[PDB]
Design a protein around this ligand. Sequence first.
Ligand SMILES: *Cc1cc2c(cc1C)nc1c(=O)[nH]c(=O)nc-1n2C[C@H](O)[C@H](O)[C@H](O)COP(=O)(O)OP(=O)(O)OC[C@H]1O[C@@H](n2cnc3c(N)ncnc32)[C@H](O)[C@@H]1O
Ligand SMILES: *Cc1cc2c(cc1C)nc1c(=O)[nH]c(=O)nc-1n2C[C@H](O)[C@H](O)[C@H](O)COP(=O)(O)OP(=O)(O)OC[C@H]1O[C@@H](n2cnc3c(N)ncnc32)[C@H](O)[C@@H]1O
Ligand SMILES: O=C(/C=C/c1ccc([N+](=O)[O-])cc1)c1cccc(C(F)(F)F)c1
Ligand SMILES: O=C(/C=C/c1ccc([N+](=O)[O-])cc1)c1cccc(C(F)(F)F)c1
Lengths: 500, 495
Amino acid sequence: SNKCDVVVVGGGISGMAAAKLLHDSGLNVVVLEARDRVGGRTYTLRNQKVKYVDLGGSYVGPTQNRILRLAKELGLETYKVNEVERLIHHVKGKSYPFRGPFPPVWNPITYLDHNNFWRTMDDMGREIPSDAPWKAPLAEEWDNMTMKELLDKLCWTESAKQLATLFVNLCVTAETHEVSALWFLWYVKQCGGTTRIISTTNGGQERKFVGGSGQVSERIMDLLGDRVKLERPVIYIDQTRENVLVETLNHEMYEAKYVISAIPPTLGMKIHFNPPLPMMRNQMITRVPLGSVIKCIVYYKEPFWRKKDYCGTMIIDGEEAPVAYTLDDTKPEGNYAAIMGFILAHKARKLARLTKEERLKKLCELYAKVLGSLEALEPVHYEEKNWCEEQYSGGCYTTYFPPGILTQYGRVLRQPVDRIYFAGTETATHWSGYMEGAVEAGERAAREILHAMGKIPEDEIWQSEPESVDVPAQPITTTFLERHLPSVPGLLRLIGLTTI
Amino acid sequence: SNKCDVVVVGGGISGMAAAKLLHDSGLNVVVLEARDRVGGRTYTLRNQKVKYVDLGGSYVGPTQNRILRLAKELGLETYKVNEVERLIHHVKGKSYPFRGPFPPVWNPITYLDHNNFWRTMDDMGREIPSDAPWKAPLAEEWDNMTMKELLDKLCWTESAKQLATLFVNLCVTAETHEVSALWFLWYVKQCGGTTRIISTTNGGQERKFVGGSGQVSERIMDLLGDRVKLERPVIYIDQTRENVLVETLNHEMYEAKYVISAIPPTLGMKIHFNPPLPMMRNQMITRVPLGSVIKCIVYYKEPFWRKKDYCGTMIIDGEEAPVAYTLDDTKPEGNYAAIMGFILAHKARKLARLTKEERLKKLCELYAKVLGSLEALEPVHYEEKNWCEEQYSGGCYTTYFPPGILTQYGRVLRQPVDRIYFAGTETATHWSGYMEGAVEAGERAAREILHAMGKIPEDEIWQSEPESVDVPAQPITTTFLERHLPSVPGLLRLI
Ligand SMILES: *Cc1cc2c(cc1C)nc1c(=O)[nH]c(=O)nc-1n2C[C@H](O)[C@H](O)[C@H](O)COP(=O)(O)OP(=O)(O)OC[C@H]1O[C@@H](n2cnc3c(N)ncnc32)[C@H](O)[C@@H]1O
Ligand SMILES: *Cc1cc2c(cc1C)nc1c(=O)[nH]c(=O)nc-1n2C[C@H](O)[C@H](O)[C@H](O)COP(=O)(O)OP(=O)(O)OC[C@H]1O[C@@H](n2cnc3c(N)ncnc32)[C@H](O)[C@@H]1O
Ligand SMILES: O=C(/C=C/c1ccc([N+](=O)[O-])cc1)c1cccc(C(F)(F)F)c1
Ligand SMILES: O=C(/C=C/c1ccc([N+](=O)[O-])cc1)c1cccc(C(F)(F)F)c1
């Protein structure tokens, strides 16, 4: 057996952040990675047509201070996603250009319903602890309904219900009827709320890395040298003896004091455990699927949309549209002009049937209609990735919880199992599901093991992160009217009262 | 490498039934079983205190003709679960004895609501094809709601809603909010409807095997001898070459023409595939969990409940009771007196933190209240099994489908992947979830391979089963009033 202090299972950002922290603390670490590459749900493709393109996780933004600090220490820089010109909301076959993060509504009743929907998402979120969502006062009531049921109760207009549906599909790559209401309200609150999660400027989609996000994992592999073992899928973990034994598919054995599991929770099923997992984890890892998404990038000779005063952002409502959301993916130098689009949830399953050429044609025909531009029918290049086909991811972006699961099984997600500690973005308390959460969880898991070894005290396991000086966060603010305008049922109550 | 015609992954009833059919046709089969035993979600324990006890699947009944034919060929006999005396419904802290399968109600409003609930479950089922529930006319509408939402719409009384909730929890060991309405309605319809699934006399719980259901898998292992490899968990299947390669955790390699996967669908995740699975199966096997149950058997000196004209069946409403359902588990001779109870769904997770002795005390105090007998506080022995703990089952009785999954992924469950064919009770079209469905699926998967080999024609893949002579089925009937009484909103629309 190959002997070390800590085996890290998985070479995504979480496992690589864990391994780097442990290596820097003076321990002997090994990273066992299933694939022929590091990065996991991040993947930067390089070729002469695109130069570089992120086919997995890409965007970072204000309040994501751990990924920004890690990236800066590795010599990486960010640039801003194009948001100079107007955004587009496409609804019932017509485009409506706008500014600001939320598509606006003019109809007064519809205005009250939209304002109440976003306000209520955040009001409910403030009842949910980031590190223990199952402790919310109405946790059981909220966990026993789907997001579809919650929107059916909250939304008194079809306009608000259709926009809210798109919001859920785009944030968690799942249908409203698939996901727990408690879990979704937790997910949004632990990113900083509705405004922060949906925004480009001042939110999650503000920036990208120059050269691609894959460089984070690659530059940590460069620091670790031969400690990273590629094409080593883990099949077996044995904790019955003094040292833990970790076996790989290609017949290698590793012996360690501790293990970090840095893989999505359900992919723990690919490992045979001795002794067996405790009952709650044994069942939890069969109850937590990942979402469904195809990330599609169409290349053009020029960013022609900018000449019509469109920034390249499209919010597209309708069953017929393959893509519900786009962003400008042009390089910061203004060349390799491109539109990035997501095919979400059921549409990722429905359209996986088509050829790559048939998906390109449907996307160009959609963009031509939304942008009112025949130039969208003249692409120069296309790249895509369907994350539903990945054996060692299971989907993208992240793990969703169906109704009933987070209250019954959520407490064991990051509970150690003897000498196994749990990393991965799913175990984060701030931007869980993102590259930020991967760093939070990897570093926290590594510090749990440093505490188990008596190298640090208990109060150093969870550490706050200084604010980035490069990516300052503007606060989220509301207006008097946003806070105090009545809901549609609030207005109806006021009318009933007056006429009495 | 060990060379054979077919590798069967899993030595439960489905894997054993498939291997026996292929062996009987003259093919060389190997069964690779992860555990140090056969039987899977069936397990019969023997000791002097119990003689034998089923800690997993146990009951068989009319219309389950495949498991009855297979067991009879292996030399097994059945006996009837005791249902001579009265059943008990325990409601708001009081026992109400009754006869006939459905607990009765006396309030006229509650009567219409209960009648409408059971009638509506069977009316919806008549629109769901057994072999393709995703082809129901309202498949998307029904798949996109939980059973909790359907019961909220249908049940105008708390009485009906609480009994419907117990019905879901008992049939599929899951909460009403965890499961798809389309999947649950399919599940009931594919067992023959509400009356057939809930009934002891003339339904699924009519009989048990003399000596235990574990004897089905054990006696097929006896026939196959050293073709059954115990403590061989499969870790890797490679289909890139001329022959399929199957590797085990203990470093053995098997080479075959074809493979049968006879494991619960989600336990496919414990196998690394080359090439990778197709996208829809890759995601499906992460979306299909198994239910949660503790099966508990309390032993007594005598079947003392019979002296009060109670048969030992208890249907126990409410959150406080650990056990919602019991049957008499006494042996056919009247000895080894026992009550079998299920701790269901969230209660299995809540009460697993207790000791074995703490669960025994809670069960004995519950039974003393419901049976109105101090004799229930004097157990002579106790056996239990928590199926939530099993690495190579994932739970019991079977796989449930959360909202949205059956319509999006259901078509993939029995679709072959190159030279891998899929067995397991989850792939059956009649009593899927049961030992009957295990036999149907294993024999169908085996005949798909015989057809691929050019040994039988396409029309012999799916084969009907003659009715058992020992366990004939009586027709399910309804009354004029059951068919025509209005619902509660029906009675209101008339007013
Ligand atoms: C896929 C995707 C993700 C994504 C996104 C868009 C798409 C299409 N958009 C994002 C964005 O703009 N900004 C952002 O911050 N996140 C975005 N996401 C999500 C993001 O990519 C993920 O949150 C993050 O990358 C997760 O990192 P983590 O380290 O937690 O997980 P991982 O990347 O999945 O790495 C796990 C590794 O483990 C290996 N593996 C799996 N099984 C084994 C076994 N048995 N043995 C050994 N290794 C194993 C995987 O191969 C992987 O490398
Ligand atoms: C657990 C349970 C089940 C049950 C029930 C009560 C309980 C507590 N009551 C039932 C009843 O009264 N009547 C009835 O007909 N069924 C009842 N059930 C369900 C029933 O037991 C199951 O439907 C049936 O036993 C399923 O059989 P099947 O053959 O489909 O599946 P299995 O028993 O799970 O067998 C699978 C085998 O595969 C092995 N395994 C798993 N992974 C591997 C790998 N990787 N490699 C090799 N072998 C593997 C398992 O160990 C198992 O033996
Ligand atoms: O929810 C959004 C975006 C979310 C999001 C989340 C994650 C990722 N990603 O991980 O890449 C991208 C977009 C989002 C954006 C603009 C408008 C709206 C709308 F208000 F619903 F209209 C919603
Ligand atoms: O649904 C039942 C039984 C189901 C059942 C299903 C499976 C098994 N098993 O696999 O052991 C046992 C009982 C059942 C029985 C009697 C009364 C009721 C009630 F009407 F809901 F009250 C329901």
